[PDB]
């Protein structure tokens, strides 16, 4: 069997990213110093640029828009995009999203290959995927594995998580590179892995294309992913969490904190209040509720239904803008 | 601990 | 290309095994202690019960019978079974066999998905295989590889080894998990790996189905896989020591020791005796003889023939029950 | 679905190379030794033999020629070759190529299986490949993976490198093993891995069959690989030093040093010279020029064109016989 | 080289 | 000069304590054991009894009473006293006080040289001292250093401590050893050191004889030291906190908690209230007060004056037996 | 013997030093945070500052001038002096010499114990000595040793070095502490130790009193030490190298570099020049001259005799002010 | 008090041992290489002298006779002896005794200070001792301690051991150094230390002068130490094995082995034979016999009495020359 | 700090 | 980034 | 303990 | 390495 056609289709849109730091060269005893004049000197230089390759990026448009993990580009002095055909351009950061580990880069180049997108919702466990990237500085490498699992939350890496799990070897430097389907269609961005050694052990994770896209579209539109805020600290009601709180068998979210002067504080949410309904949606599961509020447009008046001391309270809050971490 | 801040 | 159909056939019958261990809570200088009264009191009990993930298990029957490694089960008082659909029940351990690292769980749930079997005997190296388990408590995962070889005995892991070698990523948390063929049929139970880093490196091992079924059914009927024993400790035969009446390995087993007061011992076997036949059969291999003796029923009297001092002798022994390690 | 067919056509042509030595038997207080006479003798044998594996060789031809890595063979006084069909024989060394990590064994055996070759140039990234090797001394094992890349140079593993990058799990004991295509036709020899744990992490490197064949015919014939010598240390000219008429690297490599009484040094080459042409070849890349010099005959008179002090200088030099590393 | 028990 | 006279008086009264736990006999292939009879049998026992050295002990009295560190003796079934003259005898635990890290050992030998007790109160920082111990199993060892400080507490090593500090090298095996003055008189028992490496760095600690001796007689009549108890957990009164009509240590220790059903609980003492008087004494410092309560005979009703909410409260408590840790 | 009296005079003038940094108090899940409102309040304790020891200091004036190491005080914002009498005051940093690793602190307390000085020049190797300091924050400890050596230069620790070597255990926390004679007078300030463990191995260094007092007076006069500048780098005369006019080793210094725009640079000293005279003084040893230049006042014009290429030149230069490291 | 007079007496007689590895300057890019040419040659010094210091030596005679450890001098070519007065001399190795860890060097210089000697038998545990030597390359360094123990046999570092255990800091670089008395009379050669850190821990060992002098005189006369050989392996009579009519220490040595064709073997000695007398002296302890035989001159015909199977048997042997490790 | 228990 | 070749 | 002496 | 080559003033 072969995936070479998919490799041909997909590899040209997977660029490699790097940063440069000018640095002090190892000194010599008989050579001129900035402060001392010795026996000899150098012809044209006094410092040396070092390339420090960050990870992989994915081209999403012929306009020049690039997707990458935020951590690849974090605290970067200079981001150089190295194309598969040997081209090099200086990238402009457009925006970053620390909550979803995503950053968007802009490149001014003609003749840019773009990545043909595929639906991440249509993937299944047991599907074949190929991970394209730049592991350990070796060069463009393509790896193969199946989709080990889908939609992985509870990983505790990001505020918002919808992770594909992969069997294809992902290594340091593979971050920001593409996860593709067997036909060469982008289904994810390589983001993080679980390892004792630091090398791929068969547990890689990538951000699905649907989530990656929403944030990319938002970052291009505003330069910030806009998210909703309720200023609530929420815990799940377990059988012993309920007993400490004094509710014998109640289930669902309970608030354990109110962000000072946030939308809940003005609205009336109080610690110990079981949330029944957020904006006419039943708040049964916390992850569903947080994402709902996240997509709720800031400056909107939604109605929170709460259970306080066994009685229902119809609270009203003005959804705010989620602050950065 | 299942906790969310939103 | 997808193994998604095979995952759909197999993922439902493989479980996650958990255990709870009681723990005293973390202390605070303002909070009440078991023997101290301070300015505060949590409403929770002093002992936190921590969920701990012992491994993976396969649902073998619709009656709730389950298969896992002896090394997953051994030492845990309460075993909890988590199925793919979220149904969680408490398993009662039925029987264990440390000779094969196998153990059987009885579960009492209705609408139970069973696992379609395969033939271990029908596998060929180069065949595609899937490993289903819970690696690193990351949730159920599916790994794809191929059979790397078969019949990996003399590995020194277990008393009886007839293992499958797979290249599918196998990590801690995968033990007792299902090794499945490309149609989701169960070929093995994933038990151990060979690694420099305690993580998948591509060398994986599964007990074959043909052996596990022999063990599982024997445990269900009796509570123990009952093996025939002769109390003999043997070694191999070099042709250099085969000068007298030399057969390279024909009747090539050298007695190295006798279990004190063992069945072989009562029979009159001395160390240094070369066993030619056991129970009317050529004995030119230790592992073959180890297995042949194990399948003989306790109490069947057999005749062991040994060449001693260049003379063949006819010995009569009564097979014994094999003692626990 | 299965690579069983490819394994059946390839696995028989892969052998495991072993080395043996004698170390004395376990020391005991009452055991007669070489120095002291004590209460007991372990029979009478002074030395016990320990066989330790070195890696895997490929059976290239049915006349007994074997291909393996130089690192597998260097430092081995006696090498045993044990094929898949249980035959073990003592091999002898036709030669070695440390500059390509290749070595050739000769063996005399009846009806040897031979490896059917395939074109290295005909592989494209994304093709399925399989690995046959003895990893960790577990026994012959087959690993399936894809082709990560081709043409891997600048690794700094060897002087002359053209590696295939593979996803297949390559572990110590895989060195000198076959990397094979989906049909069982040879595409390479497995030499090394990039690993942060010393085990497979999905980045494996193999010498391609084309380079391996030409090293093998050459080692078999003249007993070694013969290469051209110029005795030059070269660095690519920088863009800063590409200040001259040559457009960047166009026709340029700087002479960093000249070997003492070397073919170029007698020729009048001086450090700081810019080589425009070697043997009327463009020479814009240091690696391509180094390969060209290696494939030039020891003893050919060639014309080096150099640019020193704004003037082209034509020099004539006698290509040497490249020395041992 | 190795030992088996039964 | 020469501390030899000091060594002559002191060295005969310091002993070495060792414990013996039979160690499993190591196996051999041609040898016998319980389960198997092999080719040879040594004329030997099934196992051998190995001996580990717990530490030093000082012969306090000619009756056979020896005083040592609690940590040196705890959870060692058999205690052997090996004398300086080579007499070795089984000793019996008379009792231990883990609060002071002391223990009393009883031996019954004739012609025992008892140690000469010096006065710990009479020593000064800058005085010459000698440590006698069996460090690292090397043998009875004599080290010379000075007294670095007196009255060391707050170390956090022990419940009740009045530590002597010495520059003299002290190592593992010195525990239970003698601290001796210039005339060879007992001034301490070596107890703990402060080491980055685990070896003496000139900062060793020993329990002074006045405290050590008092504990010993209190373990001879009774099998434990009987101490006073109020079951309170006090903290130091910070001056900033003491703005509330109070001065920094002016009758001040702050309560952090009270033992449940303790003498303090019965009396009404509360977490967060300032204690100013205990049985008419100031309680300016927690350490002075803890020691005073310990020397108050149990069952004695005493008054506690306390400052609660700006109000003096008179309380009455009946002292209880301090409980084991 | 006993040094109790020497500790009585020496110990009072030795002070402990510490810094305090405010630290966020331990949090609880139910507690109000500056960012969140939770079930309970902490009774408004915003944070808790915790004291951190920096080392020791010596009092050289009744007026409270303290001498400590620059390594002990650099980068610390708030300095507290704690004395043997238990008084604590904030110190004012007067000055720092990174060249000798020395620093000066100012205190305003009445009745300050002054340390009596000693003649550092008069010390003999073998003299008993004592180190006073706060090692490991255990409180002041006194340690006894011998002078192991004097005038240790070429240790690579400080630009200007004269060292007393001591056998007295000096641990981290002894820096800025007192090294004293057997009469209790100050012979040095202990600064560094040579160790594998990080603890004392018996090799400790103390800056001598003659230098330390000299540096301290300079800082009080000017806020820093004022020193001479030539901007010259020099090496020793290789024994073979005294080819022409090197007889008697008169020129032991070879110019290895000249400070750009330095007084010597302006003077006409060029690298490779041989210095025979500096201010009509011996140029035989490099350290002697460095010390000589340093002790020459800026603005003084001097004469340097350089042997350049077998020719003697009479140079003239205006002495500079040595710039900071 | 001072020890400076003893140091004035013994410091001249201790020397530092200097070795040289031939190493050439490590490579730098524009500097001419041994095999390559470049724009700048490294002046004219091709390589540089690299000085590695191994230890101390004591000048035992004015004829230039030196004493040191075999471990200090083993595997060296040029040993340079640097005196306290700065004079340095090349040394030639007269002889070595590795069984005592001693070496004798000869040096030719006039006005060579000779070390005054003490009597090894004279010393007491508790005597103050000085340690002169050069640890860590720092320089000659005196250290003070006391004598921890004498007769330290059974350490396990050397075959013949009588060690002075010493308190003074002995660190790496002290081997071959002098253990001096309070008056400066040499009593030992500093040899080994027991540490965990790899630095001084206060447990130091010296070879006593009485043993050291006997070895040095034998080395000067014969170039070696000559020892008796019986070729036997001996062990103590176990208490249970003295059931054969024997005192535990009487005829205590028991034969475990006889060296092949050794003096003992030729005599008729067989293992199990219990030796009662060797050369008419009681063989009570194996260490005592080991010294008695080494000291017997080779070629003496000596009787050996042995208990063989319950019968006293008279034997004779020709004491042989002891073979080397 | 608050480590006295009596 | 600065590497050398010897031929 | 018990060890061996070789002479 | 005894050819230290470093003093500055």
Numbering used by the authors:
A (entry chain J), C (entry chain F), D (entry chain B), F (entry chain H), G (entry chain L), H (entry chain D): 53 to 377
B (entry chain I), E (entry chain E), I (entry chain G): 5 to 10
J (entry chain A), K (entry chain C): 4 to 10
L (entry chain K): 2 to 10
Task: Quote the authors verbatim.
Protein samples were mixed with two types of peptide activator (tripeptide WVF, decapeptide SVRDELRWVF) prior to crystallization trials, yielding four complex structures, AlgW-tripeptide, AlgWS227A-tripeptide, AlgW-decapeptide, and AlgWS227A-decapeptide, with resolutions from 1.8 to 2.6 Å. In AlgW-decapeptide, each asymmetric unit contains a DegP-like hexamer that is stacked by two interlocked basic trimers arranged in a face-to-face manner, whereas the intertrimer contacts are stabilized by the long LA loop extending from the protease domain into the PDZ domain of another trimer. AlgWS227A-decapeptide could even generate a DegQ-like “cage” architecture after symmetry operation; the dodecamer of soluble AlgW contains four trimers, with the 12 LA loops protruding toward the interior of the cage. LA-mediated higher oligomerization is an important regulation mechanism in the HtrA family; however, very few close contacts are observed between trimers in AlgW-decapeptide and AlgWS227A-decapeptide structures, indicating that crystal packing may, in fact, dominate the above-described intertrimer associations. Fortunately, LA loops could be reliably modeled in AlgW-decapeptide and AlgWS227A-decapeptide structures, allowing us to explore the conformational regulation mode of the LA loop. By comparing the two sets of decapeptide-bound structures, we found that the LA loop shows joint angle shifts of about 7.65 degrees. In the AlgW-decapeptide structure, T72 forms side chain hydrogen interactions with D130 to maintain the β1-β4 association, while in β2, the side chain flipping of L106 not only disrupted T71-V124 interaction but also changed the dihedral angles of S105, leading β2 to form a long antiparallel sheet with β1. Additionally, K73 and E103 also altered their side chain orientations to adapt to the conformational changes. Eventually, these structural variations released the LA loop outward and exposed the active center.
